[PDB]
Design a protein around this ligand. Structure first.
Ligand SMILES: *CCC(=O)N(c1cc(C(C)(C)C)[nH]n1)[C@@H](C(=O)Nc1c(C)cccc1CC)c1cccnc1
Ligand SMILES: *CCC(=O)N(c1cc(C(C)(C)C)[nH]n1)[C@@H](C(=O)Nc1c(C)cccc1CC)c1cccnc1
Lengths: 304, 304
């Protein structure tokens, strides 16, 4: 028992982290096969971050201007191209540590692990969720760009995120591995405000199920509700509307605990209206929303 | 910016996880050089867990009874010995992935990362702290025994914990890599109750510093206090007494923020007496105590 904010083992991703330097800018790159992926803003100086014309800036760069270093050894750049907001640097050597991988574009509410890196070296791993406003609440400092978000299914790494920037409000924005930003963010130092950071309702319910499975049952009540009645309460509290798809996704947790999804919804409804009253659930004093129903099943079953 | 419960990259430890089977019991082992470390209770059947005589149980086991499997290949056991509550299985092959390592016995309040494993395969990584009552609040299921806790200093892994058991209250107990349990726990299925789980005061102050460094300053007040006055409040709230050693350890954070340690102590004192009033600090509704002052400095500086 015990429920923790658990990240995937980072080994397979550590073997892919490289350092990319273009001029005076140094950030992280992801080396898969003979291609190194990195944010295109590596070609930017501090000056042109305000209004960069990436295509124009790119014309002044040749293969030899991108310095790729894996560990203490240098990789030879034999080609370069810009795909949306990422640069793909073809190197002459396939990464011997390339795991089985896929590039996936995740939906908001989905969780992933981040391997925070600086100068191609990994410093930490934590679990995140793509917020409904397409930002991530990460822990990234200058030089962390190019650090990646991923999920692992047995031996296949699904890369879903690459860090590009910190918005003026301290939240983070990035792209999928095809270079498309999540949300409406752009790789420019401009006024970019995030939308409402709503709570991921399906994840809160999943975490309430995890709490029941681990012994924290005080919040269980004698009530039930309907999807529409629940959603009126969720709207008031800036919670994402709960759909029948979410109810279906919660099915296995509902089955294991014997607590119908709508009954857990009424427990959640009372927690929203009454608060925790100084109590805790799974060691937290607020309703945790960065565990999907799949994470609860996986953690509670011990999927390796 | 952004502050996350961050674990060390788990790569170096993943390369050391092996499966150990003795009879019908299967748990995790740690393979360093030509020795595999694992909980001695691997020799136990479900029956003898109530009152095991490990020395006697061990006499019935030979080298060939311990099956060690690293990945899909079997390791040859050429020797076995019991050191306190761990078994050391000498194998004929040195682990080619053995990183630079040390075995350390940590003090309560110290934090570490855990690589949760099942059948020698890693499933997740999370950050923990050794509680002042010598338990850890982990996330471990049956088969997780032998999973390890560690810290990394650049390229040297300091192993500090090995999981052995879950107490009837859902908390976890284990040993250092010399087999000595943290706390008064024994590897027996008997009534073992944990002591008071006091809050790690120095870690809460470190986390308040991290909050100030990241922009959360609402809890800062116009007051100061003394170590003795603070400690009277800390005693009331089951917080660990704060010493001049802790004040010294908080020095770098105090210097970076310009907030004297005793002033942060008065902020903490008011947070204890008044509560959060429905507010949050670094996304948490309670005072976080599983970041040491060293973790705050490291995370905030980007040590790789
Ligand atoms: C890896 C580069 C870097 O550290 N940052 C960065 C990104 C950019 C763009 C994408 C605009 C070219 N410029 N610099 C920062 C960052 O995003 N800095 C920043 C902040 C903190 C607030 C508002 C605007 C900007 C853009 C300059 C960075 C710092 C911490 C975490 N991630 C990225
Ligand atoms: C790896 C073996 C295992 O899963 N567990 C275990 C440990 C033991 C001892 C050390 C007593 C021989 N026996 N079984 C359990 C565990 O500790 N089980 C348990 C629980 C859950 C509560 C009270 C007593 C016991 C001891 C039998 C385990 C389960 C989850 C996490 N860690 C360990």
């Amino acid at each position: 028992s015990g429920f923790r904010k658990m990240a995937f083992p980072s080994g397979k991703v550590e073997g892919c982290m490289v350092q990319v330097t273009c001029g005076t800018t140094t950030l992280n790159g992801l080396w898969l096969d003979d291609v190194v992926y990195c944010p295109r803003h590596v070609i930017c100086t501090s000056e042109d971050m305000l209004n960069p014309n990436y295509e124009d800036l790119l014309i002044r760069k040749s293969n030899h201007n991108f310095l790729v270093q894996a560990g203490n050894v240098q990789l030879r750049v034999i080609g370069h191209s810009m795909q949306n907001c990422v640069l793909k640097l073809k190197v002459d050597t396939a990464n011997p540590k390339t795991p089985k991988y896929k590039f996936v574009r995740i939906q908001p509410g989905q969780t992933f692990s981040v391997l925070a890196c600086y100068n191609g070296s990994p410093s930490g791993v934590y679990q995140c969720a793509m917020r409904p406003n397409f930002t991530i609440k990460g822990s990234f400092l200058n030089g962390s760009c190019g650090s990646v978000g991923f999920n692992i299914d047995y031996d296949c790494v699904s890369f879903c995120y690459m860090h590009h920037m910190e918005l003026p409000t301290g939240v983070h924005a990035g792209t999928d591995l095809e270079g498309n930003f999540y949300g409406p963010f752009v790789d420019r130092q401009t006024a970019q405000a995030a939308g409402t950071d709503t709570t991921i309702t399906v994840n809160v319910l999943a975490w309430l199920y995890a709490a029941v499975i681990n012994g924290d049952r005080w919040f269980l009540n004698r009530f039930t509700t309907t999807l529409n009645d629940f959603n009126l309460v969720a709207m008031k509290y800036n919670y994402e509307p709960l759909t029948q798809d979410h109810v279906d996704i919660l099915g296995p947790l509902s089955a294991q605990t014997g607590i119908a999804v709508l009954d857990m919804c009424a427990s959640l409804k009372e927690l929203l209206q009454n608060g925790m009253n100084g109590r805790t659930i799974l060691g937290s004093a607020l309703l945790e929303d960065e565990f999907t129903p799949f994470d609860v099943v996986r953690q509670c079953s011990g999927v390796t």
